[PDB]
Amino acid sequence: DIGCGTVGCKLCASSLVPTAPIMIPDAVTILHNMNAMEDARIQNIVLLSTVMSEVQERNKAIYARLQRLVGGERKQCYVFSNDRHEQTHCVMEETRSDFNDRCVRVAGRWYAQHLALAFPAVTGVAEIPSVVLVSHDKLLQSISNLSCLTLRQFLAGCVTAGTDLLEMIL
Ligand SMILES: [Cl-]
Ligand SMILES: [Cl-]
Ligand SMILES: [Cl-]
Ligand SMILES: [Mn+2]
Ligand SMILES: [Mn+2]
Ligand SMILES: [Zn+2]
Ligand SMILES: [Zn+2]
Structure with missing residues (x-):
């Protein structure tokens, strides 16, 4: 039941375009460059649910700003439930950093x-x-x-x- 969120995808038949690179930032990128994430010049973003959980865990204020971008519905970004999707779900010798x-x-x-x-x-x-x-x-x-x-x-x-x-x- 979990789609890729890409417009015109017949496999998943959505905000992402295949005509531009699909940006998949990790939690450290969001935490260090939230001002850039919020900028209109940055588009075609995959927000992994595990990355979101890690942002929520590390910074309260950064997470609220990240939720606002999703709730705003004016940006080209998609929340992919990688923890619910059968082909991407990982279960944690691994450190929290290695698993993420x-x-x-x-x-x-x-x-x-x-x-x-x-x-x-x-x-x-x-x-x-x-x-x-x-x-x-x-x-x-x-x-x-x-x-x-x-x-x-x-x-x-x-x-x-x-x-x-x-x-x-x-
Ligand atoms: Cl590769
Ligand atoms: Cl690499
Ligand atoms: Cl971009
Ligand atoms: Mn991460
Ligand atoms: Mn990392
Ligand atoms: Zn798809
Ligand atoms: Zn960074």
Whole structure:
């Protein structure tokens, strides 16, 4: 009963678009960059229920701000119940950090493989959708459409891609 939240997905037939990278931030990213999360320039966010629980656990004020973004219904973000979904549900030798790292990695791997099947590549037109785990940790131990970057790296890559596109038109 748990969908991916992506618009036009026939597998799950929603706020996410497959035409932009699917951002999956960990709790540390939200806690350290809540002002950025709230900014209109940051769109296409997957809020994992485990990540939400971790944000609620660490910061009261940050969680209320995160709930407001969801309750506002004007942002391109989706709450994915990774703890209820059969293919992503993890049960905790693991520390609280290692378990939370595994949760995000498992949900990210599911999203990447799922979106590649739901929106397959159209020859010379478009590639499969891109999934980005937004973390300071090397979640993918330091799937082609799955990556792990910090928010700074992700945003610097956006600037590089935009500059390259502007040079192409000029
Ligand atoms: Cl963005
Ligand atoms: Cl990585
Ligand atoms: Cl990978
Ligand atoms: Mn987390
Ligand atoms: Mn972490
Ligand atoms: Zn789907
Ligand atoms: Zn951070």
